[PDB]
Amino acid sequence: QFPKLREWIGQRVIKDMAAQGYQITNKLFESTVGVKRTDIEDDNLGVYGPL
Amino acid sequence: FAPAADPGAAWYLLDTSRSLKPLIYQERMKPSFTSMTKEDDEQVFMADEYRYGVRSRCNVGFGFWQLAAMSTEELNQVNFEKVYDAMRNQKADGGRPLDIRPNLLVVPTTLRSKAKEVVGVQRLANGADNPNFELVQVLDTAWLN
Amino acid sequence: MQEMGRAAGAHPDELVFALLKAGNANLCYDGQNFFDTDHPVYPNVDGTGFAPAADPGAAWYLLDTSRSLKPLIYQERMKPSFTSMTKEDDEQVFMADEYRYGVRSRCNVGFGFWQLAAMSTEELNQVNFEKVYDAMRNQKADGGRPLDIRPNLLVVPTTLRSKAKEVVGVQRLANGADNPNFELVQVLDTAWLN
Amino acid sequence: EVEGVFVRATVERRCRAGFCFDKEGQGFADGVLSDEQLEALESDPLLKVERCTFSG
Amino acid sequence: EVEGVFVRATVERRCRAGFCFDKEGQGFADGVLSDEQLEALESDPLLKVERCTFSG
Amino acid sequence: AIITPALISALKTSFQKHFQDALATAPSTYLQVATVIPSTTASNTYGWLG
Amino acid sequence: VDVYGNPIRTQQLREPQTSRLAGLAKEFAQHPAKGLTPAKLARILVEAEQGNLQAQAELFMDMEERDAHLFAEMSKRKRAILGLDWAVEPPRNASAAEKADADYLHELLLDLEGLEDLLLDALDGIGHGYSCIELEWALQGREWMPLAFHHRPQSWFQLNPEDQNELRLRDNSPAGEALQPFGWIIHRPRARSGYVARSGLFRVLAWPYLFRHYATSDLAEMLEIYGLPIRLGKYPPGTADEEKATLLRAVTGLGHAAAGIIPETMAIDFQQAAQGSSDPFLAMMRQSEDAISKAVLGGTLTSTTSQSGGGAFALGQVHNEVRHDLLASDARQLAATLSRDLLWPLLVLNRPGSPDVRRAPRLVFDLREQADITSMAQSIPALVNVGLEIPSAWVYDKLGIPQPA
Amino acid sequence: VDVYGNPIRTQQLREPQTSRLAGLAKEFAQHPAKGLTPAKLARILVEAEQGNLQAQAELFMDMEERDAHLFAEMSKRKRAILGLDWAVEPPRNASAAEKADADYLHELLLDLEGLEDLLLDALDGIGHGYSCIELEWALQGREWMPLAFHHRPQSWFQLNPEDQNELRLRDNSPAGEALQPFGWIIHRPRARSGYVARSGLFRVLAWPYLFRHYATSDLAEMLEIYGLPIRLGKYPPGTADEEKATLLRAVTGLGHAAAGIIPETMAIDFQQAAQGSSDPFLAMMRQSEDAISKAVLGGTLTSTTSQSGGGAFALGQVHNEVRHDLLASDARQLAATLSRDLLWPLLVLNRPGSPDVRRAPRLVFDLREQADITSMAQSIPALVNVGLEIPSAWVYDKLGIPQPA
């Protein structure tokens, strides 16, 4: 951000501005479930398929 | 326990997330993997994610509270109002204020009732007063602690 | 450019509240500090001292009146025209200019030097809030007559906003006892001071 | 080498012993060290700036 | 933690003396030393490769 | 795998200019406590006779 | 109130909104086109997408000024609109009061000076994506009048941080300032569907402009180098500095000088300077110019020119496809903007009552296309002798001849 | 209820569906066209096939912006539709009540501002494969009104994991959010038979765009290198660093400088810089542009231009094959979408009863083609004198002349 507007007497100070660059990487996430192919069809109540 | 005072109306939101990729669905159906021909009749279903949070502004977030509501002079007046004063007293480069307006209070389910007492009832815990009524609206959660 | 513009737009508040901070140091037209205990209203002695300022803001003039001389004309140095790019590696300069200054309207219509707190109904609330209130209510002018001041503004730093709201905004003060100053003076936030 | 000196026989703000002065031409432009303190020392060239690298 | 391991009895090109033959050595996906030699030593696998968490 | 992902950080990383100018000054306050007195001189003076 | 329903207060109409922003009037354009590279252009466009329209507006102005072909195309396109006759019509099956209101508005627009300048200023939004014209409101007794129309540079505005389709003034604050109701005529033609920043035609035309600029500059440099060959002199060991300078001056002036003499121990070799042609540069310039012509005026008459060929139906052939479509689109959008911004304040300030917004009069441009009088005049007699009862109103309207009064 | 039969609740019409998704309005396009390679494009398309439409939508927007020829073709195609007159007609052999309903709907559409913008926004689905326009519903007493039409970017949606033809909002959840009934006008033109992801025309046009981009960039680079030749200086052993720098600067400036002198022990060799032509690049650009023209507007008028040539039947020759077919297809699809999405809510909210869906009025675009008046006017008298009783209704309808009233 800019420096505060100061008083003026004889000359102007050519101020500067800082910078605070922030670094952060990325991470990967996963969740998986192993199921039997035959079992999903081998059901009558409509369960083990929506899972 | 697990407190945090955050602004919500600022151009930035604390703890900003990153939905870099969508909730793509990964599946193992049939003649697409070897798990089902040169293996048992196995299928796996997966949800890949490639996201991560961020520590956005550490000069506007405050934590580590003994969050309490009693006596309106020692427990809340000296902790929650202390955080109020600290957040509103934050100074940027050059000594100007950050215009911090604490309006978000996040606490776990254990502190939900006591946060509601801090914000929502005119009297704090003894019939004295509650200076922090309708100043910060609290949203309950359980993902933390 | 836009950052400098917003800084310039904010500047007048900084000027006014810097003068408010210096009020305990700067002098009003009498010849004493704006917030001093020895205002020479008469051969007698009159006094008005976290740098708060109870103000009526209802008379024909308001305290710490601002003086807008020149707007925030943008000053820029982005062309080889100048010797900054000659003597240096293409250094451009961006600037904003102001020609204003704060004012000390009247030191007999303001008060400071507060030991602010809201513990007891009065014994700690009238310590400052009511002392300012009644003092202004009975400030005398030339001719031994009241100024008919109507204090209705209270400016305090951020740290004192909770106490100010308790003083004005709650029926009870800090012990469920009473609060004589409810809906008396409307407080406003500020961080430019302290 | 030295990126820049910006001396012109004038420093930006050389503040010592609680008082801030303007002399000794101690202007630098580099992140070798004391960048946080380099902000305080620099950032105030009241007078003209002349950059003459010393190739240090 | 180190991410990178090959524990499927998998084959990799490790060069002992004048020849490069099957062997499992570094077998990591991160490098801080012996990069030039690791390249020859860390030739990606010939056969099935599966990774684990040594956390060493 | 890749021999040295260490040096390829510069190319990969992207920019999110969301923290840029994510701040503002405090709301204007001199209006409530101070009154504007436009002027065009170098030293304005006020006179009252009591 | 206005068409959008925002409350309207007549107190703020006495002074322009920008009057209290004297800083804006003292600014000068930064000319970002000079020293422009593809990376700089990409950064400018991306930043404009994020709400920094100042650089984009200045770049567009420079682009308009520095390209003669693009400027000619845009000027022709705008002058096409500026030459159209216009009229104000009452709403569908309007009543006597509505007809009177429309007639009064029509009379007011006829006698309002500066209409052509207003249309020209509004049409700038075609290329810039948005044009803002400030209004000066004055009272000549009991009736409000637009004193003048002021066109404000596109560099004076920005995007709302909370809304990418809403423009705001630059008042040094992060959020800018909302536009005053009844204080502006904002024209935002929509060539492509998207946000306001991406809606300008110059955004499409920027890259061909840069290609043409690079090709022209390179051709100019190569023409400068053309002519004499570069020739290098060589000297043996033991040649002093004075002799070196003499040899250098001799080589420097040898191209202009037909003849010269040097010692046998020295040598001058004439090497190729620049050998090639203007074919690649000119090919690139032609490609860019054709792209600009197609993007601005269509690829049937300008780039792939329709060629000559007269006839009764020649007007239709030249116009209806491409030219008529573009003319009608631009005219309709401009008319909608005008009816929204200028007609409505006049109706709701200069007349009593609160007429419903849906029944407001609409400005209409005359898009009538000249119809062949001779062929149709031949055709009618056969049809009427057959027995068809063709209405005379259709004939009078389509021919342009007015009905008898 | 709606046409699809889904229950309709008037409670949810007070607020837009996306109002509770303030996160979407703050997003910025990622511009995936910059630094695009064929592998990246293939990955983008494949991922879009799987339900990640954000990257595809942003790429399509960039493609539209960065190609002048493609943008001109698409704009011309859309403006063709935007200029067509339209009317609302009652169903087959409609009754008096149905005729009144159709008339009221027609009057409502005439007086509804922003219709042209709605049509333009809907036509974006031609290239993007689907366009979604959000509705603002308001009550002016007892009658519901569309307050405004908001076009939402295609990047705001995705595919249902359980259905590849059903779109959903991006609400941070894996399954997204179902589209609110009566809250959107979804236009999904079908150029090719398949799923919604594969249905866009820009999917066909992507590869020619990349070919043209690569050719243009390579030509620009080669034009930059053209001009002076590369020349290499050689120095003998025992040349110090200062002399090396002097030789390097001399070589660097030698191309611009006509003359120079070096010691006989040194040497400068002028090597070919870039020798060839623009023919291959321009050939590739022409091929890509012809492909784009054929894909967008047909290979009879744009790419393989129909050339000049007037006449009474010239209009038919130019239009009927290709141009008329494309115009009719686009107009019919847009009319069907409108009749489904906008007309039906108005009929079922603004009028009493529950009319059957099959009897709803249908919006019709005027596709009438100008017929030669002179030839046919010559023809009728012979036929009528022969004895044929030609109806006058056919004549009035086909000529465009209205029946007497």
Author numbering:
A (entry chain bL): 52 to 102
B (entry chain bL): 160 to 304
C (entry chain bQ): 103 to 151, 160 to 304
D (entry chain bR), E (entry chain bK): 53 to 108
F (entry chain bQ): 2 to 51
G (entry chain qp), H (entry chain qr): 5 to 409
What does the paper say about this structure?
Bacteriophage Casadabanvirus JBD30, from the order Caudoviricetes, is a temperate phage that infects the bacterium Pseudomonas aeruginosa. The virion of bacteriophage JBD30 is composed of an icosahedral capsid, long flexible non-contractile tail, and a baseplate. Using its baseplate, JBD30 attaches to Pseudomonas aeruginosa via the bacterial type IV pilus, whose subsequent retraction brings the phage to the bacterial cell surface.
A pentamer of major capsid proteins on one of the capsid vertices is replaced by a connector complex formed by twelve copies of each portal (gp32) and adaptor (gp41) proteins and a hexamer of stopper proteins (gp42). The asymmetric reconstruction of the capsid–portal interface shows the symmetry mismatch between fivefold symmetry of the capsid and twelvefold symmetry of the portal. The portal complex is surrounded by five hexamers of major capsid proteins. Two major capsid proteins from each of the hexamers contact the portal. One of the major capsid proteins binds the portal complex with its extended loop and peripheral domain. The second major capsid protein, which is positioned counterclockwise when looking at the portal from the inside of the capsid, contacts the portal with its peripheral domain. In contrast, at the interface with the portal complex the N-terminus of the major capsid protein (residues 2–14) turns back and forms a short α-helix positioned parallel to the extended loop of the neighbouring major capsid protein, thus leaving more space around the fivefold axis for the portal complex. The reduction of symmetry from the twelvefold of the connector to the sixfold of the tail occurs at the adaptor–stopper interface. Asymmetric reconstruction of the JBD30 virion connector complex contains double-stranded DNA passing through the portal channel. The DNA does not interact with the stopper proteins and continues uninterrupted into the tail discs.
